[PDB]
Amino acid sequence: DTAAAIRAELAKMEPFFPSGLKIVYPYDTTPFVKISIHEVVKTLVEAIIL
């Protein structure tokens, strides 16, 4: 939730950046969390099918 709020705030800020300024995310473990939980849910669905 905090990461989502931070990203929303950065999205609010972006329209007023100087020309050329760009936001990057060199360290973010949230994608791993999302993909891992999605993989477990996929496992549950596959288990139901089997």
Q: Which residues of this protein are in contact with a copy of itself, per CB under 8 A?
A: 2-3, 6, 10, 12, 15-16, 18-30
CB atoms within 10 A of CB 7: 14
Which residue in 16, 12, 17 sits closest to 4, CA to CA?
12
Q: Tell which residue, 29, 36, 42, 31, has the closest CA to residue 50.
A: 42
CB of 26 to ligand A1AOF, least distance (A): 4
CB of 23 within 8 A of CB of 11?
no
Write the interaction track for ligand A1AOF spanning residues 12-41; mark x where CB under 6 A is met and - where it is not: --------------xx--------------
Nearer to ligand A1AOF, 16 or 27 (CB): 27
Q: Which residues would be at the binding site for ligand A1AOF (CB under 6 A)?
A: 26-27
